[PDB]
Amino acid sequence: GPPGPPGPPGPPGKLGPPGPPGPPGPP
Amino acid sequence: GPPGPPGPPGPPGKLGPPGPPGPPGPP
Amino acid sequence: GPPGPPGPPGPPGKLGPPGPPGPPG
Q1: What is the Rg, in whole angstroms, of the alpha carbon atoms belonging to chain C?
Q2: CB-based contact A13:C15 (threshold 8 Å)
Q3: Most buried among A11, A13, B8, B18, by the most CB within 10 A?
Q4: Which residues, 6+ apart, have CB-to-CB distance to A13 below 8 Å?
């Protein structure tokens, strides 16, 4: 018979990397 | 014959973006 | 018939953790 339809989309990706380091503190 | 089953689930999506900048440092 | 082909890639991940605190002022 015909091939079946395409499977479901995969799961979402994983969390991204940690963000950039923050600014210097106030004086 | 009938059409075949649905295909397998896709791959996991792409990695998320880097996070927000950190907070200000200590004084 | 044969099973279908693999599905599409999933949706994008969420943003990561906050970065580290900065250095001293």
Answers
A1: 21
A2: no
A3: A13
A4: B12, B13, B14, B15, B16, C10, C11, C12, C13
Residue tagged 């009938």 (tokens): B2
Instruction: Please report the resolution in angstroms.
Output: 1.5
Elucidation technique: X-ray
C23 CB contacts (<8 Å, ≥6 apart)? A21, A24, A25, B25
Residue numbers of B between 6 and 25 with CB closer than 8 Å to A: 6-25
Whether residue C19 contacts residue A23, with contact meaning beta carbons closer than 8 Å, is answered with no
